[PDB]
């Protein structure tokens, strides 16, 4: 065994030899070996998985360099090691796949010529891990991302990358704790990499390309599945809610709602004062490029507002926060709620109403944004309360019809969900999707 050094948390901490953290808007190594980190002028900081993350654009000034401390400088020359980090890459447009699809560019590398060492690179929709020994001998793992961009890993969502390297066997590439690729690495000699680990877009021909990297970390051992699973879930801080992309959910921001249980569905409104229902979202497909996805940004625009003043007007939404949900329709904002004695399926599934304003009829609108289930998924649940603070249920959908309207999956509030929070898929889970430059429909 070529690993270094029981409780998994202890193992992870003790085997860490590099851990990039960001506090007080400064990037530094908190491993203990204190490797110096040099941040160049155009390395930007943006929202991350738990705090801020490194953002790299395509120009020479955009880079972060880690100068390995003497105590870890030669860690991966002969021994095992693991590299992990959260990664966010914008969805590549159809044009850019055709134009730069064959352009491989590194984003993180210890290779300096010959350039022995390791590198994380991207080519079109491929994530590539490369190792090169002093003899120029090479080993690679080439992960081809899923065709369905809605569920792909290199399609604008924050995902967790982990690459283990066992010199006595193979290298394994994991995404969100799942094994995605592998390659035997026996027969490789010494890995004599550069004294610096460089985070920067190298040899990328697309001037508008960019990426985000967070929690860059190196371990002096090849982590096993259970350890990676623990590592991965240890970052999912169930306190802050997240949007579809994995960034912090925010107040006063327009979001398109998509139910996790029927991701191909968008939300639509019958009429002001009336109900909401699901409709099939338009889609995009490209046989030649073999990519497709349900298009985004269609359907109602929802806005989350503070029910009462929070902390110090924090812009992010915290699980347990009470809110007022509004639909932004034709420039007007309409509160979402359930009117007293309002139409309800079998008196249990309360039909939600948008901009209901009947005089003398109380309208329950107090909601609580919470995270009761599915920790790995960037979804949220919404709990509606009446005037007595009693639960009216979680927001979801019910199939049926109102009057002479066609059968529909109508937005409702129901306590039924609380009895099924353990199911794999539940109709009360929602994705809050904000428009983002990282995703443009073709």
Which residues here bind ligand GLA, judged by CB under 6 A?
349, 396-398, 412, 414, 416-417, 427
Least separation in angstroms between CB 395 and ligand GLA: 10
Least separation in angstroms between CB 426 and ligand GLA: 8
Least separation in angstroms between CB 373 and ligand GLA: 14
State how far the alpha carbon of 35 is from the alpha carbons of 23, 27, 86, 166, 363, in Å.
Answer: 16, 11, 20, 24, 58
| Between 389 and 419, CB nearer to ligand GLA | 419
Q: How far apart are CA 60 and CA 40, in angstroms?
A: 9
Least separation in angstroms between CB 361 and ligand GLA: 23
Least separation in angstroms between CB 412 and ligand GLA: 6
| Between 417 and 432, CB nearer to ligand GLA | 417
| Between 238 and 421, CB nearer to ligand GLA | 421
| Between 155 and 278, CB nearer to ligand GLA | 278
Q: In sequence order, which residues have a C-beta less than 8 Å from that of residue 60 and are 6 or more positions away? A: none
Q: In sequence order, which residues have a C-beta less than 8 Å from that of residue 161 and are 6 or more positions away? A: 83, 84, 85, 86, 87, 120, 127, 173, 174, 175
| Between 246 and 337, CB nearer to ligand GLA | 337
Closest residue (Cβ) to ligand GLA? Answer: 398
| Between 160 and 430, CB nearer to ligand GLA | 430
Least separation in angstroms between CB 394 and ligand GLA: 9
């Amino acid at each position: 065994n070529l690993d270094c050094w029981e409780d998994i948390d202890v193992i992870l901490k003790k085997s860490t030899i590099l851990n990039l953290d960001i506090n007080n808007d400064i990037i530094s190594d908190i491993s203990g070996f204190n490797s110096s980190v040099i941040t160049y002028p155009d390395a930007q900081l943006v929202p991350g998985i738990n705090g801020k993350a490194i953002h790299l654009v395509n120009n020479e000034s955009s880079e972060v360099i880690v100068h390995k401390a003497m105590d870890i400088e030669y860690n991966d020359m002969f021994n095992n090691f693991t590299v992990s980090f959260w990664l966010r890459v914008p969805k590549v447009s159809a044009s850019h796949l055709e134009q730069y699809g064959t352009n491989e560019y590194s984003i993180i590398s210890s290779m300096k010529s010959i350039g022995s060492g390791w590198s994380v690179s991207l080519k079109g929709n491929n994530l590539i891990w490369t190792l090169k020994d002093s003899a120029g001998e090479v080993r690679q793992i080439t992960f081809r991302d899923l065709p369905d961009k809605f569920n792909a890993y290199l399609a604008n969502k924050w995902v967790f990358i982990t690459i283990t390297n066992d010199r006595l066997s193979s290298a394994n590439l994991y995404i969100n704790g799942v094994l995605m690729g592998s390659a035997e690495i026996t027969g490789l000699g010494a890995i004599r990499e550069d004294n610096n680990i460089t985070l920067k877009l190298d040899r990328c021909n697309n001037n508008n390309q960019y990426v985000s990297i967070d929690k860059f970390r190196i371990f002096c051992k090849a982590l096993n599945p259970k350890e990676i699973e623990k590592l991965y879930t240890s970052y999912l801080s169930i306190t802050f809610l997240r949007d579809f992309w994995g960034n912090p959910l925010r107040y006063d921001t327009e979001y398109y709602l998509i139910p996790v249980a029927s991701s191909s569905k968008d939300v639509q409104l019958k009429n002001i004062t009336d109900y909401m229902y699901l409709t099939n979202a338009p889609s995009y497909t490209n046989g030649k490029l073999n990519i497709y996805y349900r298009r985004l940004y269609n359907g109602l625009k929802f806005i989350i507002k503070r029910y009462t003043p929070n902390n110090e007007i924090d812009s992010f939404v915290k699980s347990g926060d009470f809110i007022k949900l509004y639909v932004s329709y034709n420039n007007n904002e309409h509160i979402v709620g359930y009117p007293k004695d309002g139409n309800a399926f079998n008196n249990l599934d309360r039909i939600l109403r948008v901009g209901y304003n009947a005089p003398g009829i109380p309208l329950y609108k107090k909601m609580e944004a919470v995270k009761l289930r599915d920790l790995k998924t960037y979804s949220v649940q919404l709990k509606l309360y009446d005037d007595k603070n009693a639960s009216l249920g979680l927001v979801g959908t019910h199939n049926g019809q109102i009057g002479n309207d066609p059968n529909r999956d109508i937005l409702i509030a129901s306590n039924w969900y609380f009895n099924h929070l353990k199911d794999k898929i539940l109709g009360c889970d929602w994705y809050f999707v904000p428009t983002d430059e990282g995703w443009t429909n073709d």
